[PDB]
């Protein structure tokens, strides 16, 4: 009911890194404090590292196990965007803002970081556990994918959106907004594929899959809180970032056809500024009574 519509929306959102000139960001970058520059670098590396997993494994593995030519095509398109567009865009932002030696060090740090690794390996673990012709294991991986696309990225997206909403780092913020817009549709699409599997299950199996999804969400959420304090306490933003994580967790759940887990909260206004019944023919004698 939905793949051709998503095909259309995906291909019409096509873009390339070269379209946004990045050099003018240096005019606001130079005015940020060390903690702001440090947080930005670390957040950016976090997003880059997670998105690489999605391009190399997450999207291609789902495309491999999903049946249907049109679904495979949409999934291929999404994998292409991760590897050919998003990855080059993150690299471009880095090369503009930091010298080569600084980039290498930030990636070394974020590569060793406990909270980034915990979530990266949790997601990758579920992708590696998919078994041929087993729709339960595929569903679990789709849940992981939706959580990455619609939830885990957002502790990171917060900061570029925060600057973007203030008139700072506008070129890289525009790029991030385009990336985020792609991840949103990726999350919604994979969510619909997961619901299709979920709806084929018994009531007991459904309850079991719901417990899986909520348990996974809880593990990731508790690690996100730690990840958040680790990066954002030094710039005083953690309270507001936490509200943004919960709001996006609720969107991820709704993508999977589940109820929101967290109470509704308002979001930081600066970040906000950055952001058929069955047809049956008449058989005659239906006109007579």
């Amino acid at each position: 009911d939905f793949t051709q519509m998503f095909y259309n929306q995906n291909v019409k959102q096509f873009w390339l890194p070269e379209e946004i000139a990045l050099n003018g960001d240096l005019l606001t970058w130079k005015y940020l404090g060390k903690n702001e520059q440090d947080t930005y670098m670390k957040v950016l590396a976090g997003l880059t590292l997670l998105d690489t997993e999605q391009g190399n494994t997450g999207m291609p593995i789902v495309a491999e196990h999903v049946d249907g030519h049109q679904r495979k095509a949409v999934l291929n398109f999404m994998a292409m965007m991760e590897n050919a567009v998003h990855a080059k865009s993150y690299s471009n932002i880095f090369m503009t803002l930091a010298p080569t030696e600084t980039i290498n060090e930030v990636f070394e740090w974020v590569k060793q970081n406990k909270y980034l690794q915990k979530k990266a390996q949790m997601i990758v673990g579920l992708y590696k556990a998919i078994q041929k012709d087993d729709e339960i294991s595929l569903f679990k991986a789709m849940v992981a994918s939706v959580y990455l696309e619609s939830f885990l990225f957002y502790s990171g997206f917060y900061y570029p959106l925060y600057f973007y909403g203030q008139g700072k780092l506008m070129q890289s913020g525009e790029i991030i907004n385009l990336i985020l817009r792609d991840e949103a549709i990726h999350g919604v699409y994979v969510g619909l594929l997961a619901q299709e599997i979920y709806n084929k299950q018994t009531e007991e199996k459904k309850a079991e899959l719901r417990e899986f999804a909520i348990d996974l969400l809880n593990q990731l959420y508790e690690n996100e809180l730690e990840y958040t304090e680790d990066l954002y306490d030094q710039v005083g933003l953690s309270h507001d970032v936490k509200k943004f994580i919960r709001y996006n967790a609720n969107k991820a759940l709704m993508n999977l056809g589940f109820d929101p887990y967290f109470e509704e909260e308002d979001i930081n206004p600066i970040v906000l500024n950055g952001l058929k019944a069955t047809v049956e023919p008449l058989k005659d004698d239906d006109f007579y009574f």
Partner: protein, 683 residues
């Protein structure tokens, strides 16, 4: 969470396997002992309250100046002597959130229920203290409920208009289209729902002065009206609601319907304008015989005959249209069009269905005009004459644009008080007053029709509540017998009050002499058929009240012949959406959607049980979706035989049933004499 919210949520927490309905009552007490009494503004006496409300531009001083303060005090004391108590939390909540007068900053409550009722009664009486007390007793007993515009806005300085619905006829011209857009914006600014008949507008691909394939059809006018209603949205408080009605024989009927398809493009899709389809008996006959039908280009018909396509009878002129080479037409499959209607109603609940011949076979004012379309709620069915809005510096030919004032009888309270006659007459007087004090300075046809037709709409609520609280199944023949008798009584006393007003004022409605009221035809079925209850239980229900017989109807017919009727139209059964909460009544004559409804307000959730719901009457409060729609159609037809205008008839469908079932329900409604069908709500 508030204490009353917890008490109201305690209803669903079952005790010994039964719902805790009594907890609801506790909630109201809490809602008053913790919120309403603390948030109310009290004065030393009524004089200070009235002065504060008058000088602070809360109340109009003119209607209060017709009474001495002693009379106003007596009216307020009469209102408060009843010691009215809201039996459910949601009734009081809905009144004090939607209808009670608040301060400018909306931080305090200035009007209680008794205060609002007293103000409305004083406005109704127009200087008569005894009449004001009668209105106070009628409303505090909750026998009669003025419509949401009238109840909310009567006697208020910052008020809008007291008329709920307006119906506009749009002539086939750019000047008329622009005037219709202007009048729609003006009336939506006044707060009323606007319905526009687009059947006179020529279809897409017609000629504008000899250049062919030039018109955008009714879809362009639909887009213009949709943007106009979006712009005029009651100052951003309530979304602007409009209705477009098109005859099913219009060539644009498909494109019209395509405005509501969920796959429609943005250049065609219309989202704030409801759509209604007017189906003559000819279309149903063609669909029944499976003969391919023809939709027509209105401008070619107007050129050939000098009259609009919807201005004449299709049942007698369809063959002439088809055989006329100078009339342009397109071939359609009427059964496919019916299936498209059913599919559209399943998907979105649109279009409204108006069976034109069912309306006009009993229409009393066919001489003035045939009813060609309905209102936004598809219950107003009145004669309308299109207006000729000419160029600037040229005089406009002002026609008749329908507009009536709504008011609902609470069937349970009316029959409990054994006061059908008194309630009907007082409600007719109040609606006549609302019509008389209505003067709209930007809708000329509406103003002229209000002054001439003097049409009012007297509805009814709590039919299902009364039936379930008296142990009568809504689908049972006993319920239909009760509806027949009760609404025959309502029609009898409404006609009697209209004739009495005509006698006391020496004037009838315009062109009454050509109506079936003047010729006595209207009373035919009333002077030959007896509408007394056929069941002993219903007769006992009507005990203590004089049920009119054929002799009383003959006397009323003679009285009307001697004196005439003041109102062209008297009875119309509106949906009565939110004001039914305050009256502790089921919405309109429709069956209840659910026994207990869960509604989310703010961050809290509340449960409203149906009025009088309990263990002994749980199964008598059968949900509408679980009911046979054919028996609901039978009930609505039984009521409709005594209602001169239409009834907002919502179809309640299950997800399992197909579009063929919806088409069968529609065709049975047409067969049974149903005038209009409001909504196809699917569970």
């Amino acid at each position: 969470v508030p204490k009353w919210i917890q008490l109201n949520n305690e209803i669903m927490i079952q005790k010994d396997g039964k719902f805790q309905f009594d907890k609801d009552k506790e909630a109201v007490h809490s809602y008053f002992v913790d919120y309403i009494n603390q948030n109310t503004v009290f004065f030393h006496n009524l004089k200070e309250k009235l002065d504060y409300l008058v000088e602070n531009q809360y109340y109009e001083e003119e209607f209060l100046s017709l009474y001495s303060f002693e009379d106003i005090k007596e009216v307020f004391k009469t209102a408060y002597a009843k010691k009215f108590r809201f039996p459910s939390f949601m009734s009081a909540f809905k009144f004090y959130n939607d209808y009670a007068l608040k301060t400018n900053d909306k931080k305090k409550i200035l009007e209680r229920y008794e205060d609002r009722i007293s103000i409305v009664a004083l406005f109704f009486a127009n200087g008569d203290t005894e009449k004001a007390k009668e209105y106070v007793n009628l409303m505090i007993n909750q026998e009669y409920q003025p419509s949401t515009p009238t109840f909310l806005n009567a006697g208020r300085k910052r008020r809008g208009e007291l008329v709920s619905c307006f119906l506009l006829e749009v002539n086939d011209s750019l000047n008329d289209i622009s005037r219709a857009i202007d009048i729609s914006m003006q009336l939506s600014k006044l707060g009323g729902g606007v319905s526009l008949n687009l059947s006179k507008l020529r279809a897409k691909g017609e000629a504008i002065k000899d250049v062919e394939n030039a018109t955008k059809g009714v879809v362009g006018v639909m887009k213009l009206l949709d943007n106009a209603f979006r712009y005029a949205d009651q100052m951003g408080q309530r979304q602007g609601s409009g209705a477009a009605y098109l005859n099913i024989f219009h060539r644009d009927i498909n494109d019209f319907l395509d405005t509501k398809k969920i796959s429609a493009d943005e250049d065609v899709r219309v989202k704030t304008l409801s759509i209604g389809v007017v189906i003559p008996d000819k279309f149903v006959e063609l669909a029944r015989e499976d003969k391919a039908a023809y939709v027509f280009y209105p401008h070619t018909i107007y050129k050939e005959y000098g009259q609009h396509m919807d201005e004449m009878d299709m049942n007698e002129m369809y063959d002439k249209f088809v055989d006329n080479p100078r009339v342009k037409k397109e071939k359609i499959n009427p059964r496919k069009l019916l299936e498209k209607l059913a599919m559209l109603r399943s998907e979105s609940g649109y279009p409204y269905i108006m069976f034109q011949d069912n309306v006009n076979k009993v229409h009393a004012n066919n001489h003035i005009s045939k009813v060609k379309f309905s209102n936004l709620c598809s219950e107003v069915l009145q004669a309308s004459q299109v207006s000729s809005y000419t160029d600037y510096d040229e005089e406009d030919e002002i026609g008749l644009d329908i507009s009536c004032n709504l008011g609902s009888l609470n069937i349970l309270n009316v029959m409990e008080h054994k006061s059908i006659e008194k309630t009907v007459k007082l409600a007719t007087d109040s609606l006549t007053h609302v019509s008389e004090t209505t003067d709209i300075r930007n809708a000329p046809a509406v103003r002229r029709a209000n002054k001439a037709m003097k049409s009012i709409g007297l509805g009814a609520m709590n039919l299902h509540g009364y039936l379930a609280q008296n142990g009568i199944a809504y689908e049972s023949p006993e319920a239909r017998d009760f509806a027949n008798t009760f609404f025959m009584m309502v029609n009898f006393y409404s006609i009697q009050r209209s004739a009495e007003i005509a006698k006391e004022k020496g004037e009838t409605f315009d062109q009454y002499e050509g109506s079936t009221y003047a010729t006595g035809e209207y009373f035919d079925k009333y002077v030959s058929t007896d509408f007394s209850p056929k069941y002993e239980k219903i007769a006992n229900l009507f005990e203590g009240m004089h049920i009119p017989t054929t002799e009383d109807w003959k006397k009323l017919k003679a009285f009307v012949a001697e004196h005439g009727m003041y109102h062209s139209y008297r009875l119309c059964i509106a949906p009565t959406g939110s004001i039914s909460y305050v009256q502790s009544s089921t919405a309109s004559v429709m069956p209840i959607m659910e026994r207990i409804e869960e509604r989310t307000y703010g961050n809290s959730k509340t449960y409203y049980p149906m009025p009088g719901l309990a263990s002994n009457n749980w199964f008598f409060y059968k949900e509408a979706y679980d009911m046979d729609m054919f028996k609901v159609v039978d009930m609505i037809a039984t009521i409709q035989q005594h209602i001169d205008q239409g009834i907002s008839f919502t179809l309640f469908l299950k997800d399992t049933m197909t579009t063929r079932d919806l088409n069968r329900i529609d065709l049975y409604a047409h067969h049974r004499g149903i005038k209009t069908i409001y909504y196809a709500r699917t569970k």
